[PDB]
Amino acid sequence: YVKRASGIARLGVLRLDVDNLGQAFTHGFMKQGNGKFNTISRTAAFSRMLSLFFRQHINYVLKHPKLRPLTGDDPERSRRATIIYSGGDDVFVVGAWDDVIEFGIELRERFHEFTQGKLTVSAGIGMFPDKYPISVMAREVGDLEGAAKSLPGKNGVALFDPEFTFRWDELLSKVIEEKYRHIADYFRCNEERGMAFIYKLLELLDQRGDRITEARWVYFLMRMRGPTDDTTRFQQFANRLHQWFQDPSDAKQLKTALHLYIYRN
Amino acid sequence: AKIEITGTITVVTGLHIGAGGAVDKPVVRDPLTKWPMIPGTSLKGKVRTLLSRQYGADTETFYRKPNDDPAQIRRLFGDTKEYKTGRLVFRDTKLTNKDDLEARGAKTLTEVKFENAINRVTAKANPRQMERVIPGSEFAFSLVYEVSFGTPDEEQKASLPSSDEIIEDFNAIARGLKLLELDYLGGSGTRGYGQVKFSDLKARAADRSLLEMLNHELAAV
Amino acid sequence: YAKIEITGTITVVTGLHIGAGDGFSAIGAVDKPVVRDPLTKWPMIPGTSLKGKVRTLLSRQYGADTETFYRKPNDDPAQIRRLFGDTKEYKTGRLVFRDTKLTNKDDLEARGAKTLTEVKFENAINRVTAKANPRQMERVIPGSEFAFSLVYEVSFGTPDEEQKASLPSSDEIIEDFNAIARGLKLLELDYLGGSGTRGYGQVKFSDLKARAAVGTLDRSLLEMLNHELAAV
Amino acid sequence: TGYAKIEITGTITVVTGLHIGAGDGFSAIGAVDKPVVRDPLTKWPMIPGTSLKGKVRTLLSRQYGADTETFYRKPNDDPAQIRRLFGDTKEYKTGRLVFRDTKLTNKDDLEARGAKTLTEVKFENAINRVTAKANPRQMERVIPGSEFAFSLVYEVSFGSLPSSDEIIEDFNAIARGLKLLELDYLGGSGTRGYGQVKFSDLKARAAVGTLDRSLLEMLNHELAAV
Amino acid sequence: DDYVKQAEQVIRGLPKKNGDFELTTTQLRVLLSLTAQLFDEAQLSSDQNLSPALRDKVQYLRVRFVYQAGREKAVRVFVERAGLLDELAQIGDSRDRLLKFCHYMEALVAYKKFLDPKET
Amino acid sequence: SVIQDDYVKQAEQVIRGLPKKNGDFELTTTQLRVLLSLTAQLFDEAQLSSDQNLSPALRDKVQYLRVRFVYQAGREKAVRVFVERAGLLDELAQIGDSRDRLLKFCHYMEALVAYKKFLDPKET
């Protein structure tokens, strides 16, 4: 799973456990109706559905997936990952980093359609090379579901580091479909353009706490247009990236959107 | 035990070394001080594109990479497959006589030669500019050869090269950096930046009559 | 393998004006000061300003007898493409021009001159008001001699598509030394600098000889080319 | 019918004086304040090809015009039949006639006829009709015997190319336009006894290119004539 | 302070003659390629009060400004609308105002690049 | 005020000390082509002198500059008023030791063409 990937060749890890599963029946029935519903056939039911969601229904969301914001171009291009153990509270999947990071949200979008806003999760996804050892392939991704499980709302995700800790609603909307679906689309038609330009960019988001980085932000932005490209949409293409710069959390989503394109290629 | 080649390299034209004021694509610069430096690679990478046309291309050489070079090339610069040694290092260098370039007037240390692009359907000018380092720019120079114990992946173990193998190699430095001066160094593809002129070439230790026997080849530039 | 440079001496006939935008002008404001030698600020002929002024002529020369028009800087014929370059077939060419600063500065001080360049006050009389608009266009003294050296690698063609490293015969180096001096001839019968067709920018050659500095080449060819060269 | 750069020889000669001037030159002697266009090195009198353009530009615009009457108010308003030689910003064209500079050729014969200083100071005067006061001045001009060479070229068809007749009549338009200037002033201080020139030995040749056979002697007709 | 924020609006206040600007950046090419080299000799010098060789390097940069603005139509308005000569009279103490001033000029040409098409 | 370092600052106020008569200036630009296209040829050779002292073969190249200065005040009046208060001649008087005063005077006159474009349109 690192021998084929056009782009980076990085084996992506995924571990994900459903939160608060000790309170699944001890205090998961006794807040509505003062708890007359606590019975064995009503508590052996969700533990008969979790033996299909995390053990058989994950074969649907992997063999023929839906969401493809990095790869695209085929609806049923199969996930090239491989699940370690499909069972119970914890799912452990390792494949290429590309298919996992879409599926790692996509399986959660087969999870918020069952609990429908009551059970929460926090996942962990990292990217590693092929010959990387296992004993630190599970002590560092034990911080990626170790930091977003320390979220005050507990329903989030952490990508690649403990400083990227984002909500599930902040990830598929703000990062990919807003900010990553801004960057690689102005040169969607020029798909091979400089990612040797875009690794200039996230230097500035590290030095964002200096004043002249505002000036260097717009400086490099209009170092891309001219007479050799279609410049019907360039004033807003930098202005979207200019308004994102000033806010101390708008660019937090942006760094991950920049990272997705350079690691896609 | 280090065969140190000292020297001084000096251009006479402009010199455009890509680096990937509102200059579009400037020269490479020493990022502590932003002086123009000669990158270590395109010394090594010009010579192994000249000497893979001179030692090669006599004897009907396709030479479709720096991996299928002749032995006399891969002896000096190394490769993947046989990998004699990495035997020639090129010490990178930056501009030297900067205050003596200032004291005789040239204060910019880079001019920007404006240019032009005449389309042949409308005779419309299309301005454009590059940056060149000053023609009077005089870099210091070094590259370090060594007593060179060999590392054979081949079965001819510990085969230390002989004194005939040194002077076949310091033929290739006489043949290298002299043939440079009749070609480029940087950009301006067939257009005039990269005529260079070497000064004060030497070899130096860092046997004894071999030392004078090698400097000869280096008086030949 | 060999390296046949082409040395000599170029010499302005009329005044010459090549001046690019505004590079540096501390004292003397003119319209466009001439391109100078930035440590010393002696005039020069930049190699691009010679290369296009040769190449554009040959495009009109292999065109306008085969009558095809050559409109891009990358679709001239091969005998231009092999010399100057391409981006589709012969990616790096063979001729490598240089710029050249003012060689003969002391005789041009021994022969009484003062400024190394001259300020030619022009005018422009409009026809409605019958009034003149002044100009200040300045040019280089008409008796100065820059140097000349354009080197010439021998033929070898590997970057092409099917004829890998197929060195052609010794007629092509005669054809590719024909069009050098033929190219240097059509520049003798044309302007070089700015304000041509107005009496500037005419240049005169001399000493047009070849010699090999690096490489092996027979005298049976090196005297065919040197007598292909100095004649024109 | 391939390529051609028709080079034009000949020798211009001042019959009267000539005071094509340079404004603020650097001759620095006195009343050389009305100088002539000199060489900077030899300090010999010369002639810019701008003036030989900018007289045949002017004095054919009002001879090909001022008959078609529309006054041709700007040096793009001129018709194609002038500016296809002389150049325009309309079609961006490079001209087609490189009027070259020329300088003092026969300085040697002018020392043979004893002509001493090569520039004679022709005095003039101002009389005001009420005062009858003489206000003098020291105007300076070239020797009226000196002779400059003559060199223009003419590029052939390039752009899908001007045909044979377009070489003929347009070259004939030069010779029509040149004999005007022979009977006209050239230098400064026109209309007042200056700046008349005499042309001679004006022939065509094939300096380079494959010039044709019939289309050369027709061009050696009128330019040798006028 | 305001001085890196000032250039966000003083370039909207430049009077665009045809609607497109009158000050293209190439008219400053002898200027912004002469202060970019002053900017890099400034901070690499470690003393706050400038070296005497750098004391009069800006003196030519000052004199070039008053010429180039008075030479062209476009830079006729750009100096005093940014207050560049107004900052340059008193800069002979230390690099603190100088490295502010070059950073100020950095913001200008950056915002000049953004507030126009400005093709290559 | 030390005049030799106010020499690059003196050029702003003594360019107003020349009096304009119409309200427009009298010393236009094209009146001084022979002191700008003839001092760049002194500037390109003074900087190349590595020696502190001038060459004798250069010491006359300023004398033809000196004689052109004393000539151009006789020929024109707008340049006649330019010089005597600016005092160009006093810096060309005792300049004969080394290029200390010369590189000042090489620098002093690029400041005076600088302010003259400033105090006037200089249009196109």
mmCIF file of N, CA, C and O in Angstrom, chain F residues 2 8-9 21 27 38 42 52 66 74 84 95 103-104 121:
data_model
loop_
_atom_site.group_PDB
_atom_site.id
_atom_site.type_symbol
_atom_site.label_atom_id
_atom_site.label_comp_id
_atom_site.label_asym_id
_atom_site.label_seq_id
_atom_site.Cartn_x
_atom_site.Cartn_y
_atom_site.Cartn_z
ATOM 1 N N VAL F 2 28.255 71.357 9.481
ATOM 2 C CA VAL F 2 29.401 70.948 8.677
ATOM 3 C C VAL F 2 28.961 70.859 7.219
ATOM 4 O O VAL F 2 28.114 70.034 6.860
ATOM 5 N N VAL F 8 25.248 67.020 0.836
ATOM 6 C CA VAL F 8 24.177 66.274 0.180
ATOM 7 C C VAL F 8 22.820 66.777 0.650
ATOM 8 O O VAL F 8 21.784 66.432 0.068
ATOM 9 N N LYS F 9 22.805 67.651 1.650
ATOM 10 C CA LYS F 9 21.593 68.321 2.082
ATOM 11 C C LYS F 9 21.505 69.770 1.631
ATOM 12 O O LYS F 9 20.404 70.327 1.628
ATOM 13 N N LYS F 21 12.091 83.502 -12.587
ATOM 14 C CA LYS F 21 11.624 84.820 -13.009
ATOM 15 C C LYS F 21 10.175 84.838 -13.462
ATOM 16 O O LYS F 21 9.385 85.634 -12.946
ATOM 17 N N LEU F 27 16.448 77.672 -15.573
ATOM 18 C CA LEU F 27 17.463 76.659 -15.843
ATOM 19 C C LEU F 27 16.736 75.369 -16.182
ATOM 20 O O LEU F 27 16.378 74.586 -15.310
ATOM 21 N N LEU F 38 29.056 64.545 -19.541
ATOM 22 C CA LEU F 38 30.494 64.706 -19.463
ATOM 23 C C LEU F 38 31.008 64.550 -18.043
ATOM 24 O O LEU F 38 32.222 64.585 -17.829
ATOM 25 N N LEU F 42 33.415 61.234 -16.023
ATOM 26 C CA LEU F 42 34.337 61.362 -14.909
ATOM 27 C C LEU F 42 33.972 60.419 -13.774
ATOM 28 O O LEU F 42 34.861 59.928 -13.068
ATOM 29 N N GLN F 52 44.457 56.420 -3.995
ATOM 30 C CA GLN F 52 43.899 57.569 -3.297
ATOM 31 C C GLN F 52 44.170 58.855 -4.061
ATOM 32 O O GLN F 52 43.293 59.716 -4.169
ATOM 33 N N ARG F 66 36.694 71.673 -15.974
ATOM 34 C CA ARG F 66 36.757 73.001 -15.374
ATOM 35 C C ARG F 66 36.567 74.087 -16.416
ATOM 36 O O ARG F 66 35.800 75.033 -16.206
ATOM 37 N N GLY F 74 29.643 81.880 -19.397
ATOM 38 C CA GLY F 74 29.688 82.939 -20.384
ATOM 39 C C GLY F 74 28.636 82.802 -21.463
ATOM 40 O O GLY F 74 28.072 83.804 -21.908
ATOM 41 N N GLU F 84 27.470 80.621 -9.193
ATOM 42 C CA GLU F 84 28.276 81.498 -8.343
ATOM 43 C C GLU F 84 27.873 81.435 -6.875
ATOM 44 O O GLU F 84 28.700 81.716 -5.999
ATOM 45 N N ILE F 95 41.215 71.067 -5.809
ATOM 46 C CA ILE F 95 40.910 69.638 -5.817
ATOM 47 C C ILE F 95 42.124 68.767 -6.106
ATOM 48 O O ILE F 95 42.016 67.533 -6.078
ATOM 49 N N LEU F 103 35.203 63.017 -5.162
ATOM 50 C CA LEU F 103 34.053 62.148 -4.960
ATOM 51 C C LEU F 103 32.951 62.839 -4.174
ATOM 52 O O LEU F 103 31.793 62.422 -4.263
ATOM 53 N N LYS F 104 33.287 63.879 -3.409
ATOM 54 C CA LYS F 104 32.266 64.801 -2.931
ATOM 55 C C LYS F 104 31.626 65.535 -4.096
ATOM 56 O O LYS F 104 30.399 65.533 -4.243
ATOM 57 N N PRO F 121 7.473 70.175 -12.842
ATOM 58 C CA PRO F 121 6.824 68.995 -13.427
ATOM 59 C C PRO F 121 7.744 67.923 -14.011
ATOM 60 O O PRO F 121 7.728 66.798 -13.499
#
